[PDB]
């Protein structure tokens, strides 16, 4: 009961330029970047980071401006590689050990320490962190228990601490979160029920209320959200549609959540909040023919950009403009789906 994953991870460089990371046909992580912020078409082209990947990569900027990418290696350990100055000079790959059985996801703590979450060999959630802002060493791997059947998804909550969500072996959504307590720094796992058939994705509304999206057992998009910042949750509610990938979500320029997914015609579809109350738009097609979940990012000018694999395994993209969306164009490449779950 898994849905098609995204095939890249995107981030902005410190200067605003988007950069994407994916696994090529030779099983290496490759990357491609805007040569100046906000451009429609001026990209570097694809450059290899070498070696061998066995998961979807994940990138996050450090609090000093350096991008850092994470992937599972051929040994099933977590590996990482970083810019040595903002925008350039990759370190080469170094091991963070462990055995992971999901794709890794990255969080940044309010103090500037990166932290990675992944499923372990015992199907529990594990995590590992920088011990100082934007600097090694990293901690040992530590277990947060649970039984996971999806990638974890993480966001900062209204208390400024991480909250992590995953599907469990009852096919329901569960979460855990970090507190200020020394004795119980992380909560017990708590259920939000549901039957979900994709990876879940969490995001925060502009006012701090978390919201989670996932495909349901009827292949519609479903969602569940907090009734106030760091409060309890609604029931699961349907946004209808027929989604044939994991959903992706980002806040738009209007401060409203906007969800993207592949549809049953293999086009890219999207849907957005139209009020603060639970009002949403109609599902709306952006056309295209895609062979992955979408990945959504935002340019320095505030406009969204969506990436997805095309019919020939190249990376396609479509950009929001001041009044519309652009045409679909190709960034080339030959991407595989190396997702560690499926
Ligand atoms: C360090 O421990 C190893 O890596 C963790 C991330 C888990 O997969 C655990 O089951 C495994 O033995
Ligand atoms: C310079 O890069 C910093 O130190 C390295 C040794 C790694 O621990 C990395 O996570 C961190 O960003
Ligand atoms: C030092 O790092 C902090 O404390 C550890 C014991 C973990 O609970 C981790 O989530 C947190 O980031
Ligand atoms: C709460 O409802 C349950 O979970 C939703 C996310 C959907 O999968 C629905 O079909 C199922 O009955």
Numbering used by the authors: 30 to 371
Please give me the paper's original passages concerning this structure.
All studied lectins belong to the seven-bladed β-propeller structural family. Each blade makes a W-motif composed of four antiparallel beta-strands (β1-β4) connected by β-turns and loops. The saccharide binding sites are located between the adjacent blades and are uniquely organized in two separate circles around the monomer.
The lowest avidity effect can be seen for PLL3, the only monomeric protein in this family. Residues involved in ligand binding are highly conserved throughout the PLL family. The orientation of the ligand in the H-type binding site is consistent across all PLLs. C6 of αMeFuc points inside the binding pocket, where it is stabilized via hydrophobic interaction. Two highly conserved tryptophans (e.g. W265 and W251 in PLL3-4H site) are essential in stabilizing the ligand via CH-π stacking interaction with C6, C5, and C4. Additional ligand stabilization is formed by a hydrogen bond between O3 and the side chain of the polar amino acid (Ser/Thr; e.g. S246 in PLL3-4H site) if presented in the β-turn T2. The methyl group on C1 of methyl-α-l-fucoside ligand is oriented towards the solvent, providing sufficient space to accommodate potential binding of methyl-β-l-fucoside in the H sites of PLLs. The ligand in the P-type binding site has a distinct orientation, where C6 is pointing outside the binding pocket. In human blood activated by zymosan A, PLL2 and PLL3 inhibited ROS production, suggesting these lectins interfere with the innate immune system reaction in the early stages of the Photorhabdus infection. Different behaviour was seen for d-galactose, which inhibited only the binding of PLL3 and not PLL2, despite confirmed binding to both proteins from ITC, suggesting that d-galactose aims for different binding sites than MGMR in PLL2.
